[PDB]
Amino acid sequence: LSPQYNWVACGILEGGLKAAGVLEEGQYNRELAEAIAAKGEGFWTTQFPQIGDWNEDQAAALADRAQTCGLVKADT
């Protein structure tokens, strides 16, 4: 219930995700994570495995925040 996952924050989130253009209709947690990671990888990820990982890690976790907001469906 608390100001962790309300509609405002989730709105800011949903906004931000459509902004960077990775959100989609009927989308699954995993599909988004992979899209966020795509737009995340550049020099630093492609040149450093450890940052390449950090990317996938945060990309994955961000989709989790996104799932709790009802923005994406759980993987099936």
Ligand X SMILES: C[As](C)(=O)[O-]
Residues 14 and 74 sit within 8 Å (Cβ to Cβ): no
Residues 37 and 56 sit within 8 Å (Cβ to Cβ): yes
Determine if 57 is a binding residue for Zn ion (CB under 5 A).
Answer: yes
Asked if residue 34 belongs to a known ligand binding site, the reply is no
Determine if 75 is a binding residue for Zn ion (CB under 5 A).
Answer: no
Nearer to ligand X by C-beta: 35 or 71? 71
Of all residues in this chain, which one has the CB nearest to Zn ion in the complex? 57
- Which of 21, 25, 43, 76 forms a contact with ligand X (CB under 6 A)? 25
